[PDB]
Amino acid sequence: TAKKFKVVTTFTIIQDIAQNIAGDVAVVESITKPGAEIHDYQPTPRDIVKAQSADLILWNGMNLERWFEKFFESIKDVPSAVVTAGITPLPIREGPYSGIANPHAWMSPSNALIYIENIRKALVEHDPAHAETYNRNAQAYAEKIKALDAPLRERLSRIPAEQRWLVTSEGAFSYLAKDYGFKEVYLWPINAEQQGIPQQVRHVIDIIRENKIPVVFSESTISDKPAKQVSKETGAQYGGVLYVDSLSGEKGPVPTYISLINMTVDTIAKGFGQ
Numbered sequence: 419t420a421k422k423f424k425v426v427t428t429f430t431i432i433q434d435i436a437q438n439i440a441g442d443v444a445v446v447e448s449i450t451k452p453g454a455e456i457h458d459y460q461p462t463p464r465d466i467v468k469a470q471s472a473d474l475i476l477w478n479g480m481n482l483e484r485w486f487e488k489f490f491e492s493i494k495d496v497p498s499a500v501v502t503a504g505i506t507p508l509p510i511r512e513g514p515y516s517g518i519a520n521p522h523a524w525m526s527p528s529n530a531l532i533y534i535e536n537i538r539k540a541l542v543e544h545d546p547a548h549a550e551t552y553n554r555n556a557q558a559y560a561e562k563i564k565a566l567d568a569p570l571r572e573r574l575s576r577i578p579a580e581q582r583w584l585v586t587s588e589g590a591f592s593y594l595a596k597d598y599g600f601k602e603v604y605l606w607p608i609n610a611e612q613q614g615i616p617q618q619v620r621h622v623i624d625i626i627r628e629n630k631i632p633v634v635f636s637e638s639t640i641s642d643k644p645a646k647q648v649s650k651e652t653g654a655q656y657g658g659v660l661y662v663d664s665l666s667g668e669k670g671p672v673p674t675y676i677s678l679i680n681m682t683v684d685t686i687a688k689g690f691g692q
């Protein structure tokens with residue numbers, strides 16, 4: 419066991435999934451830090467260094483990392499793989515990004531199985547000496563992710579179907595909402611320039627009041643102020659922060675992808691009174 423195969427990912431969700439497949443034969447690091455905004459992140463010379471010293475670079479595609487393709491052109495002789503191949507996208511419904519794929523496909527546990535299979539194939543292709551370990555680790559992790567779905571689905575099914583309204587800041591939860599039958603309301607469709615401007619706020623306020631939606635949420639890499647504004651003006655309680663674009667630090671409450679799905683689903687269910 420000389421030097422461990424080095425994998426660099428764009429953000430922390432992919433880092434944790436890939437580290438579970440790599441096990442102890444590879445080290446996986448994320449370019450963005452926990453808590454950092456990933457859509458419009460601005461790479462630094464130190465990020466170039468990290469990616470250039472990798473053996474494999476992983477990214478989401480589906481229009482998530484607006485910075486990645488310009489950044490990756492600075493990198494020489496390091497293979498890359500997009501980990502969303504074979505996932506059927508949901509389009510962004512409005513705004514300047516309307517009609518393109520919604521990137522947040524990892525918020526569906528079923529989609530996470532496809533992430534695992536793509537990351538496995540990329541590790542096996544570019545570090546073939548350890549293929550048996552990658553294959554074993556992916557089979558074990560896919561079994562955890564597969565089993566994850568049933569208890570989450572049952573928990574959210576307790577919410578009456580006609581009251582299943584997921585009101586968030588970024589419209590980052592479209593794939594989770596589809597899986598579990600939630601109608602989706604958000605202050606902005608995807609992180610970009612306009613985030614909490616008027617028109618956006620008042621539309622969400624109108625849908626809340628008409629449907630008596632009991633809770634509204636923010637997310638961990640953006641400001642909580644628009645959601646708290648919405649809850650102050652309506653009957654909705656502020657449900658807290660959901661995790662989608664970033665894990666927490668390893669010593670925080672959301673250190674893993676499994677913990678992220680569990681925490682987001684639990685926070686939603688609590689927002690509805692379980």
Ligand SMILES: [Fe+3]
Nearest residue numbers: 588590609663
């Ligand atoms: Fe996002």
